Every structure is written in structure tokens, then in C-alpha cells.
Amino acid sequence: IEFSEFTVKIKNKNNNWADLGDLVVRKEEDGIETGLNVGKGDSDTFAGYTATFFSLEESEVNNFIKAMTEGGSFKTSLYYGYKDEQSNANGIQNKEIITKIEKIDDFEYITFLGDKIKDSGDKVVEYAILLEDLKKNLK
């Protein structure tokens, strides 16, 4: 593995598809951590919202690369998601992420579902990230 840390724009769907913020992807000694940065800086608070989004351990690293460049699946060790998700407060462990390559306005995105919305039941958030952005950083 050659990458260190990179940043991609991440969109979510609740519709519409909306631009949400940045996803920061970091290779750690054991596995990968992602963090989400959402919204405005201030003085000089970096963003409105900065936190671990999910993480995964070393043994899922090859699944994550394949999933994020070709579509597939990987297991997170820990998933929080964003503030609307039930997981955001307390995390969910061992949640499997399923990725798909889908077209939105003619461009290929990697899409995936997150967790259920905090106080709906069955309704889950969906995320998308430009496929080329991921391929170039994860080769």
C-alpha cells in the first residue's frame, strides 16, 4: 500500500443528492481511518463538523481498496457516519459497507449506504464519491 492521506468530496442523499463535505482517508499502522469534515470554518475552527466517519482494520484493507475502485464490500471496525445517523452518537461495530459504481449526471460515483436515520426506522442515508477521485488516490 502506498498512500498516506488524501481528501475527497463526499455527497449524500437523504433526495436530492447534496454535496456534504470532505472525506479524509488515512492509512494507519493497522488499517484505514476516515474522517468527515463538514461545513464552514470560523476563527479558526477548521470546519462546522470534524469527526471519524468510519475505520477498518488491516485485514479489510484489500477489500476496501477493491470496493472503493471496483465496487464490492468491506467490514468496518467502527462506523459513526454523520449527525443524522443513529450511529453518530455511539458508533456501530463490525458494519459491512457495500459499494456500487453508479452514474449521476453522467459521471461515475462510488455509492454506498450508511446507517438508519436517527429517529426514522427503516430509512438509511446513502453516500457518493467520485469514482475517479478514489481511483487516482488508491491506484
PDB file of N, CA and C in Angstrom, residues 14-87:
ATOM      1  N   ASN A  14     -30.581  11.816   1.316  1.00  0.00           N
ATOM      2  CA  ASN A  14     -31.405  11.559   2.476  1.00  0.00           C
ATOM      3  C   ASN A  14     -32.750  10.835   2.367  1.00  0.00           C
ATOM      4  N   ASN A  15     -34.254  12.765  -1.438  1.00  0.00           N
ATOM      5  CA  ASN A  15     -33.307  13.485  -2.223  1.00  0.00           C
ATOM      6  C   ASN A  15     -33.400  14.953  -1.942  1.00  0.00           C
ATOM      7  N   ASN A  16     -32.417  15.696  -2.388  1.00  0.00           N
ATOM      8  CA  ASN A  16     -31.622  15.375  -3.525  1.00  0.00           C
ATOM      9  C   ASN A  16     -30.388  14.597  -3.165  1.00  0.00           C
ATOM     10  N   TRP A  17     -29.496  14.421  -4.110  1.00  0.00           N
ATOM     11  CA  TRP A  17     -28.123  14.259  -3.808  1.00  0.00           C
ATOM     12  C   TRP A  17     -27.653  15.670  -3.481  1.00  0.00           C
ATOM     13  N   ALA A  18     -26.999  15.847  -2.363  1.00  0.00           N
ATOM     14  CA  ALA A  18     -26.397  17.141  -1.967  1.00  0.00           C
ATOM     15  C   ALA A  18     -24.890  16.947  -1.742  1.00  0.00           C
ATOM     16  N   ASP A  19     -24.088  17.997  -1.955  1.00  0.00           N
ATOM     17  CA  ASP A  19     -22.661  17.943  -1.638  1.00  0.00           C
ATOM     18  C   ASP A  19     -22.645  17.994  -0.110  1.00  0.00           C
ATOM     19  N   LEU A  20     -21.967  17.076   0.581  1.00  0.00           N
ATOM     20  CA  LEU A  20     -21.930  17.167   2.054  1.00  0.00           C
ATOM     21  C   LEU A  20     -20.668  17.837   2.620  1.00  0.00           C
ATOM     22  N   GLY A  21     -19.499  17.388   2.169  1.00  0.00           N
ATOM     23  CA  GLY A  21     -18.251  17.929   2.674  1.00  0.00           C
ATOM     24  C   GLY A  21     -17.092  17.149   2.112  1.00  0.00           C
ATOM     25  N   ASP A  22     -16.055  17.077   2.939  1.00  0.00           N
ATOM     26  CA  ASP A  22     -14.883  16.307   2.625  1.00  0.00           C
ATOM     27  C   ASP A  22     -14.789  14.986   3.389  1.00  0.00           C
ATOM     28  N   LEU A  23     -14.318  13.938   2.707  1.00  0.00           N
ATOM     29  CA  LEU A  23     -13.892  12.722   3.353  1.00  0.00           C
ATOM     30  C   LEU A  23     -12.371  12.623   3.268  1.00  0.00           C
ATOM     31  N   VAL A  24     -11.748  12.607   4.451  1.00  0.00           N
ATOM     32  CA  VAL A  24     -10.303  12.415   4.629  1.00  0.00           C
ATOM     33  C   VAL A  24     -10.027  10.907   4.871  1.00  0.00           C
ATOM     34  N   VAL A  25      -9.202  10.267   4.021  1.00  0.00           N
ATOM     35  CA  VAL A  25      -8.840   8.903   4.096  1.00  0.00           C
ATOM     36  C   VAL A  25      -7.369   8.691   4.477  1.00  0.00           C
ATOM     37  N   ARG A  26      -7.077   8.042   5.628  1.00  0.00           N
ATOM     38  CA  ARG A  26      -5.694   7.945   6.156  1.00  0.00           C
ATOM     39  C   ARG A  26      -5.314   6.512   6.361  1.00  0.00           C
ATOM     40  N   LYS A  27      -4.176   6.125   5.796  1.00  0.00           N
ATOM     41  CA  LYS A  27      -3.585   4.825   6.077  1.00  0.00           C
ATOM     42  C   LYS A  27      -2.846   4.835   7.448  1.00  0.00           C
ATOM     43  N   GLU A  28      -3.270   3.960   8.376  1.00  0.00           N
ATOM     44  CA  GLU A  28      -2.712   3.953   9.718  1.00  0.00           C
ATOM     45  C   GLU A  28      -1.865   2.699   9.843  1.00  0.00           C
ATOM     46  N   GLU A  29      -1.296   2.482  11.009  1.00  0.00           N
ATOM     47  CA  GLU A  29      -0.450   1.280  11.125  1.00  0.00           C
ATOM     48  C   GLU A  29      -1.320   0.016  10.998  1.00  0.00           C
ATOM     49  N   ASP A  30      -2.479  -0.006  11.648  1.00  0.00           N
ATOM     50  CA  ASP A  30      -3.419  -1.090  11.471  1.00  0.00           C
ATOM     51  C   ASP A  30      -4.590  -0.611  10.676  1.00  0.00           C
ATOM     52  N   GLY A  31      -4.639  -0.916   9.390  1.00  0.00           N
ATOM     53  CA  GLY A  31      -5.810  -0.470   8.626  1.00  0.00           C
ATOM     54  C   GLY A  31      -5.888   0.977   8.160  1.00  0.00           C
ATOM     55  N   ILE A  32      -7.125   1.435   8.012  1.00  0.00           N
ATOM     56  CA  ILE A  32      -7.537   2.754   7.496  1.00  0.00           C
ATOM     57  C   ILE A  32      -8.562   3.440   8.409  1.00  0.00           C
ATOM     58  N   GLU A  33      -8.402   4.740   8.652  1.00  0.00           N
ATOM     59  CA  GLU A  33      -9.399   5.613   9.275  1.00  0.00           C
ATOM     60  C   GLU A  33      -9.902   6.669   8.292  1.00  0.00           C
ATOM     61  N   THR A  34     -11.217   6.923   8.297  1.00  0.00           N
ATOM     62  CA  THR A  34     -11.736   8.048   7.543  1.00  0.00           C
ATOM     63  C   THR A  34     -12.363   9.027   8.464  1.00  0.00           C
ATOM     64  N   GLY A  35     -12.301  10.275   8.061  1.00  0.00           N
ATOM     65  CA  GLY A  35     -12.884  11.338   8.832  1.00  0.00           C
ATOM     66  C   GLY A  35     -13.673  12.262   7.911  1.00  0.00           C
ATOM     67  N   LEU A  36     -14.715  12.817   8.451  1.00  0.00           N
ATOM     68  CA  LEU A  36     -15.561  13.688   7.715  1.00  0.00           C
ATOM     69  C   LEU A  36     -15.472  15.091   8.264  1.00  0.00           C
ATOM     70  N   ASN A  37     -15.293  16.031   7.368  1.00  0.00           N
ATOM     71  CA  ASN A  37     -15.240  17.451   7.608  1.00  0.00           C
ATOM     72  C   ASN A  37     -16.414  18.062   6.889  1.00  0.00           C
ATOM     73  N   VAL A  38     -17.279  18.710   7.622  1.00  0.00           N
ATOM     74  CA  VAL A  38     -18.472  19.268   7.038  1.00  0.00           C
ATOM     75  C   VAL A  38     -18.653  20.691   7.461  1.00  0.00           C
ATOM     76  N   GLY A  39     -18.723  21.554   6.487  1.00  0.00           N
ATOM     77  CA  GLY A  39     -19.043  22.924   6.724  1.00  0.00           C
ATOM     78  C   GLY A  39     -17.935  23.871   7.056  1.00  0.00           C
ATOM     79  N   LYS A  40     -18.366  25.106   7.064  1.00  0.00           N
ATOM     80  CA  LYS A  40     -17.649  26.321   7.331  1.00  0.00           C
ATOM     81  C   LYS A  40     -16.600  26.308   8.386  1.00  0.00           C
ATOM     82  N   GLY A  41     -15.431  26.824   8.056  1.00  0.00           N
ATOM     83  CA  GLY A  41     -14.527  27.255   9.091  1.00  0.00           C
ATOM     84  C   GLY A  41     -14.993  28.554   9.760  1.00  0.00           C
ATOM     85  N   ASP A  42     -14.272  28.964  10.791  1.00  0.00           N
ATOM     86  CA  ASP A  42     -14.565  30.165  11.518  1.00  0.00           C
ATOM     87  C   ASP A  42     -13.280  30.819  11.976  1.00  0.00           C
ATOM     88  N   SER A  43     -13.112  30.919  13.286  1.00  0.00           N
ATOM     89  CA  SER A  43     -11.943  31.559  13.788  1.00  0.00           C
ATOM     90  C   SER A  43     -11.333  30.801  14.933  1.00  0.00           C
ATOM     91  N   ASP A  44     -10.315  30.002  14.663  1.00  0.00           N
ATOM     92  CA  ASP A  44     -10.082  29.431  13.372  1.00  0.00           C
ATOM     93  C   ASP A  44     -10.439  28.003  13.611  1.00  0.00           C
ATOM     94  N   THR A  45     -11.719  27.781  13.768  1.00  0.00           N
ATOM     95  CA  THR A  45     -12.238  26.453  13.856  1.00  0.00           C
ATOM     96  C   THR A  45     -12.336  25.942  12.431  1.00  0.00           C
ATOM     97  N   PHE A  46     -11.694  24.802  12.216  1.00  0.00           N
ATOM     98  CA  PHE A  46     -11.465  24.228  10.879  1.00  0.00           C
ATOM     99  C   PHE A  46     -12.740  24.091  10.037  1.00  0.00           C
ATOM    100  N   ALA A  47     -13.750  23.481  10.641  1.00  0.00           N
ATOM    101  CA  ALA A  47     -14.986  23.215   9.952  1.00  0.00           C
ATOM    102  C   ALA A  47     -16.132  23.325  10.958  1.00  0.00           C
ATOM    103  N   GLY A  48     -17.350  23.301  10.451  1.00  0.00           N
ATOM    104  CA  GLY A  48     -18.521  23.140  11.291  1.00  0.00           C
ATOM    105  C   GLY A  48     -18.476  21.804  12.026  1.00  0.00           C
ATOM    106  N   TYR A  49     -17.912  20.776  11.402  1.00  0.00           N
ATOM    107  CA  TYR A  49     -18.043  19.424  11.905  1.00  0.00           C
ATOM    108  C   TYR A  49     -16.853  18.622  11.395  1.00  0.00           C
ATOM    109  N   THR A  50     -16.110  18.060  12.345  1.00  0.00           N
ATOM    110  CA  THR A  50     -14.973  17.179  12.064  1.00  0.00           C
ATOM    111  C   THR A  50     -14.948  15.960  13.010  1.00  0.00           C
ATOM    112  N   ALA A  51     -14.980  14.746  12.468  1.00  0.00           N
ATOM    113  CA  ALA A  51     -15.013  13.525  13.272  1.00  0.00           C
ATOM    114  C   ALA A  51     -14.717  12.318  12.410  1.00  0.00           C
ATOM    115  N   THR A  52     -14.177  11.274  13.038  1.00  0.00           N
ATOM    116  CA  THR A  52     -14.150   9.948  12.463  1.00  0.00           C
ATOM    117  C   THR A  52     -15.508   9.621  11.855  1.00  0.00           C
ATOM    118  N   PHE A  53     -15.461   9.123  10.635  1.00  0.00           N
ATOM    119  CA  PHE A  53     -16.600   8.665   9.888  1.00  0.00           C
ATOM    120  C   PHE A  53     -16.712   7.146  10.020  1.00  0.00           C
ATOM    121  N   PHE A  54     -15.651   6.441   9.654  1.00  0.00           N
ATOM    122  CA  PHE A  54     -15.501   5.016   9.960  1.00  0.00           C
ATOM    123  C   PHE A  54     -14.067   4.607   9.937  1.00  0.00           C
ATOM    124  N   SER A  55     -13.813   3.405  10.442  1.00  0.00           N
ATOM    125  CA  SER A  55     -12.492   2.868  10.352  1.00  0.00           C
ATOM    126  C   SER A  55     -12.545   1.386  10.091  1.00  0.00           C
ATOM    127  N   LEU A  56     -11.430   0.817   9.673  1.00  0.00           N
ATOM    128  CA  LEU A  56     -11.374  -0.620   9.380  1.00  0.00           C
ATOM    129  C   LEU A  56      -9.961  -1.096   9.682  1.00  0.00           C
ATOM    130  N   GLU A  57      -9.829  -2.358   9.928  1.00  0.00           N
ATOM    131  CA  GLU A  57      -8.567  -2.901  10.309  1.00  0.00           C
ATOM    132  C   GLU A  57      -7.774  -3.417   9.111  1.00  0.00           C
ATOM    133  N   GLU A  58      -6.531  -3.799   9.363  1.00  0.00           N
ATOM    134  CA  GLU A  58      -5.598  -4.124   8.287  1.00  0.00           C
ATOM    135  C   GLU A  58      -6.088  -5.180   7.380  1.00  0.00           C
ATOM    136  N   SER A  59      -6.632  -6.236   7.956  1.00  0.00           N
ATOM    137  CA  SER A  59      -7.125  -7.351   7.174  1.00  0.00           C
ATOM    138  C   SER A  59      -8.288  -6.980   6.216  1.00  0.00           C
ATOM    139  N   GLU A  60      -8.982  -5.870   6.452  1.00  0.00           N
ATOM    140  CA  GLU A  60     -10.008  -5.461   5.475  1.00  0.00           C
ATOM    141  C   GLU A  60      -9.503  -4.435   4.429  1.00  0.00           C
ATOM    142  N   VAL A  61      -8.247  -4.050   4.539  1.00  0.00           N
ATOM    143  CA  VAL A  61      -7.671  -3.066   3.634  1.00  0.00           C
ATOM    144  C   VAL A  61      -7.770  -3.415   2.151  1.00  0.00           C
ATOM    145  N   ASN A  62      -7.438  -4.645   1.773  1.00  0.00           N
ATOM    146  CA  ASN A  62      -7.600  -5.061   0.369  1.00  0.00           C
ATOM    147  C   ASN A  62      -9.068  -5.080  -0.139  1.00  0.00           C
ATOM    148  N   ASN A  63     -10.020  -5.478   0.717  1.00  0.00           N
ATOM    149  CA  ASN A  63     -11.419  -5.361   0.385  1.00  0.00           C
ATOM    150  C   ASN A  63     -11.775  -3.874   0.222  1.00  0.00           C
ATOM    151  N   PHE A  64     -11.312  -3.033   1.112  1.00  0.00           N
ATOM    152  CA  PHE A  64     -11.696  -1.629   0.993  1.00  0.00           C
ATOM    153  C   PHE A  64     -11.189  -1.015  -0.336  1.00  0.00           C
ATOM    154  N   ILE A  65      -9.971  -1.303  -0.705  1.00  0.00           N
ATOM    155  CA  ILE A  65      -9.383  -0.767  -1.968  1.00  0.00           C
ATOM    156  C   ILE A  65     -10.197  -1.252  -3.149  1.00  0.00           C
ATOM    157  N   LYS A  66     -10.423  -2.570  -3.230  1.00  0.00           N
ATOM    158  CA  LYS A  66     -11.176  -3.123  -4.319  1.00  0.00           C
ATOM    159  C   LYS A  66     -12.582  -2.496  -4.339  1.00  0.00           C
ATOM    160  N   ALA A  67     -13.249  -2.482  -3.167  1.00  0.00           N
ATOM    161  CA  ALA A  67     -14.622  -1.959  -3.085  1.00  0.00           C
ATOM    162  C   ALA A  67     -14.718  -0.538  -3.536  1.00  0.00           C
ATOM    163  N   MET A  68     -13.706   0.255  -3.162  1.00  0.00           N
ATOM    164  CA  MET A  68     -13.760   1.679  -3.454  1.00  0.00           C
ATOM    165  C   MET A  68     -13.291   2.083  -4.883  1.00  0.00           C
ATOM    166  N   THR A  69     -12.808   1.135  -5.650  1.00  0.00           N
ATOM    167  CA  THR A  69     -12.371   1.399  -7.001  1.00  0.00           C
ATOM    168  C   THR A  69     -13.121   0.564  -8.062  1.00  0.00           C
ATOM    169  N   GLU A  70     -13.639  -0.604  -7.643  1.00  0.00           N
ATOM    170  CA  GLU A  70     -14.387  -1.501  -8.474  1.00  0.00           C
ATOM    171  C   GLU A  70     -15.785  -1.809  -8.007  1.00  0.00           C
ATOM    172  N   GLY A  71     -16.206  -1.423  -6.773  1.00  0.00           N
ATOM    173  CA  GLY A  71     -17.488  -1.903  -6.236  1.00  0.00           C
ATOM    174  C   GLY A  71     -17.239  -3.247  -5.584  1.00  0.00           C
ATOM    175  N   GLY A  72     -17.892  -3.501  -4.441  1.00  0.00           N
ATOM    176  CA  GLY A  72     -17.596  -4.710  -3.636  1.00  0.00           C
ATOM    177  C   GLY A  72     -18.063  -4.510  -2.212  1.00  0.00           C
ATOM    178  N   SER A  73     -17.332  -5.052  -1.226  1.00  0.00           N
ATOM    179  CA  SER A  73     -17.776  -4.894   0.154  1.00  0.00           C
ATOM    180  C   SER A  73     -16.541  -4.934   1.085  1.00  0.00           C
ATOM    181  N   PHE A  74     -16.662  -4.269   2.221  1.00  0.00           N
ATOM    182  CA  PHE A  74     -15.647  -4.374   3.285  1.00  0.00           C
ATOM    183  C   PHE A  74     -16.349  -4.203   4.619  1.00  0.00           C
ATOM    184  N   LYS A  75     -15.704  -4.735   5.640  1.00  0.00           N
ATOM    185  CA  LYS A  75     -16.139  -4.560   7.025  1.00  0.00           C
ATOM    186  C   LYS A  75     -15.394  -3.430   7.746  1.00  0.00           C
ATOM    187  N   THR A  76     -16.138  -2.488   8.302  1.00  0.00           N
ATOM    188  CA  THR A  76     -15.579  -1.533   9.229  1.00  0.00           C
ATOM    189  C   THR A  76     -15.449  -2.115  10.640  1.00  0.00           C
ATOM    190  N   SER A  77     -14.515  -1.601  11.439  1.00  0.00           N
ATOM    191  CA  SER A  77     -14.386  -1.959  12.858  1.00  0.00           C
ATOM    192  C   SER A  77     -15.320  -1.039  13.594  1.00  0.00           C
ATOM    193  N   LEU A  78     -15.419   0.156  13.081  1.00  0.00           N
ATOM    194  CA  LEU A  78     -16.248   1.146  13.714  1.00  0.00           C
ATOM    195  C   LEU A  78     -16.821   2.126  12.735  1.00  0.00           C
ATOM    196  N   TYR A  79     -18.137   2.399  12.820  1.00  0.00           N
ATOM    197  CA  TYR A  79     -18.806   3.310  11.927  1.00  0.00           C
ATOM    198  C   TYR A  79     -19.641   4.286  12.745  1.00  0.00           C
ATOM    199  N   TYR A  80     -19.429   5.587  12.518  1.00  0.00           N
ATOM    200  CA  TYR A  80     -20.279   6.624  13.099  1.00  0.00           C
ATOM    201  C   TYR A  80     -21.174   7.306  12.106  1.00  0.00           C
ATOM    202  N   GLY A  81     -20.659   7.577  10.905  1.00  0.00           N
ATOM    203  CA  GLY A  81     -21.463   8.264   9.948  1.00  0.00           C
ATOM    204  C   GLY A  81     -21.599   9.717  10.323  1.00  0.00           C
ATOM    205  N   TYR A  82     -22.570  10.385   9.702  1.00  0.00           N
ATOM    206  CA  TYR A  82     -22.840  11.831  10.012  1.00  0.00           C
ATOM    207  C   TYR A  82     -24.008  12.006  11.012  1.00  0.00           C
ATOM    208  N   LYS A  83     -24.289  13.256  11.410  1.00  0.00           N
ATOM    209  CA  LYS A  83     -25.079  13.560  12.635  1.00  0.00           C
ATOM    210  C   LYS A  83     -26.518  13.060  12.588  1.00  0.00           C
ATOM    211  N   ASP A  84     -27.069  12.853  11.398  1.00  0.00           N
ATOM    212  CA  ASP A  84     -28.427  12.337  11.246  1.00  0.00           C
ATOM    213  C   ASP A  84     -28.537  10.843  11.497  1.00  0.00           C
ATOM    214  N   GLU A  85     -27.400  10.144  11.516  1.00  0.00           N
ATOM    215  CA  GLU A  85     -27.432   8.691  11.647  1.00  0.00           C
ATOM    216  C   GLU A  85     -27.483   8.273  13.092  1.00  0.00           C
ATOM    217  N   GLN A  86     -28.195   7.172  13.281  1.00  0.00           N
ATOM    218  CA  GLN A  86     -28.341   6.611  14.596  1.00  0.00           C
ATOM    219  C   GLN A  86     -26.991   6.311  15.205  1.00  0.00           C
ATOM    220  N   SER A  87     -26.044   5.857  14.391  1.00  0.00           N
ATOM    221  CA  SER A  87     -24.698   5.528  14.800  1.00  0.00           C
ATOM    222  C   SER A  87     -23.842   6.708  15.259  1.00  0.00           C
TER     223      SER A  87
END
